[PDB]
């Protein structure tokens, strides 16, 4: 009760491949599309699409930001419950250059 449920009860989003909390992100949709949740470091831009005879996509990893960059990657997230200060430490561990590659068990 007194360290999560009544101080900083936060339900963030965790990418279940790279293991982060900050770098998840609600997708800025196309004007008829639906704002999903896409990560950052699992997401590579669409430019890396070298070459079955083609590399066609089934409309899964294709998301854009408010900047408009087509990224391919970054899906498969979920909802956890962390204290917010953990998210603050994760930035301050990133400031040192130290990640927190988590594990999230329903997979």
């Amino acid at each position: 009760d007194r360290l999560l449920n009544s101080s900083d009860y936060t339900q963030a989003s965790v990418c279940r491949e790279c293991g982060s909390i900050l770098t998840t992100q609600q997708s800025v949709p196309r004007i008829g599309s639906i704002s999903t949740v896409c990560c950052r470091r699992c997401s590579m831009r669409f430019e890396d699409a070298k070459k079955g005879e083609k590399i066609f996509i089934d409309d899964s990893q294709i998301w854009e930001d408010g900047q408009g960059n087509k990224f391919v990657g970054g899906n498969e997230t979920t909802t956890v419950a962390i204290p917010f200060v953990l998210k603050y430490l994760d930035s301050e561990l990133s400031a040192m250059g130290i990640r927190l590659r988590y594990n999230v068990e329903p997979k």
Binding site: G52, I55, F56, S60, A81
Partner: protein, 199 residues
């Protein structure tokens, strides 16, 4: 170096089971069965009737929406199979309450039937109406399709009014039409379908 890491991406999107051109109708086969595993959140109020709670809360809003995991519009389901957390089949199975909620989560096997559009497919469905630059269709009385003049040859003109079609035989075209499917675009909530005609 970067030749076996690309196989993480080539195996990522490409679906395995194709749509073979079956019974020589011109149509391929696109209704396909696959079994899955959910991860439900059973209600406390559906403790007495836990089969009705899994279906109503997670399976009745599952049909007739495009699903990004199977890659298909979920047509229908049948046959829920709630697992157990006691590895002892029988009636009184037992599920695991989350420590902070009264909501207890578990595993379920269930069987789905979806629709499978791909590239390189050729299908047949009724045309509803048309224009002088696009022609829209219906497939299986559930599925749209649109064929536009950038998929249509040059000599197919247009009798003008509802204005009908003029092919190289000079006839307004019928309902059912053979067509080759282009990239499917799921931008709207309604599943939009693109298609071509030339080989």
């Amino acid at each position: 170096n970067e030749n076996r890491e690309t196989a993480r991406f080539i195996k990522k999107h490409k679906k395995q089971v194709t749509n073979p051109i079956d019974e020589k109708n011109g149509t391929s086969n696109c209704i396909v069965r696959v079994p899955i595993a959910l991860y439900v959140s059973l209600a406390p109020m559906y403790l007495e009737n836990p089969l009705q709670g899994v279906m109503k809360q997670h399976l009745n809003p599952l049909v007739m929406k495009y699903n990004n995991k199977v890659g298909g519009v979920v047509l229908g389901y049948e046959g829920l199979k709630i697992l157990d957390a006691d590895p002892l089949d029988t009636s009184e199975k037992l599920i695991k309450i989350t420590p902070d909620t009264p909501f207890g989560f578990t595993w379920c096997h269930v069987n789905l039937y979806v629709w499978q559009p791909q590239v390189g497919d050729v299908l047949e469905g009724y045309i509803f109406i048309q224009s002088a630059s696009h022609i829209g269709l219906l497939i299986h009385d559930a599925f749209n399709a649109s064929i536009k003049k950038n998929n249509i040859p040059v000599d197919w003109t247009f009798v003008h009014n509802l204005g009908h079609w003029v092919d190289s035989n000079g006839e307004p075209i019928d309902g059912k039409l053979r067509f080759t499917v282009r990239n499917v675009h799921t931008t709207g909530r309604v599943v939009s379908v693109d298609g071509t005609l030339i080989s």
